[PDB]
């Protein structure tokens with residue numbers, strides 16, 4: 001599924017991501033934009049041989065099991081394919097654990113480099129929320 005911007009904002013809000021660990025909804029929407037372009041089926045190979053899965057590009061090194069990331073953990077206890085679902089429940093549940101891990105949203109390098117400190121509320125402008 002390719003979400004629309006306000007569609008994704010509404011789904012993230014419904015699953016309680018807005019102001020989760022103090023990150024306003026615009027931060028989550030901005031991260032999804034640059035990680036996945038709002039595409040639930042986005043997969044990208046990392047140099048270390050790990051893969052990033054889904055709207056929030058969650059890494060098989062630590063968070064999900066893909067059967068092919070040696071020495072990896074599955075701290076969200078889910079198959080990585082569950083993060084490609086048109087239903088974002090699993091991706092949100094996992095992102096909550098990631099963002100609780102001590103470095104907040106800096107764990108998303110595209111958030112640090114492209115969203116952090118910017119006008120993130122622009123991302124939920126004109127949305128019926």
Ligand code: NA
Nearest residue numbers: 060064072073
């Ligand atoms: Na893994």
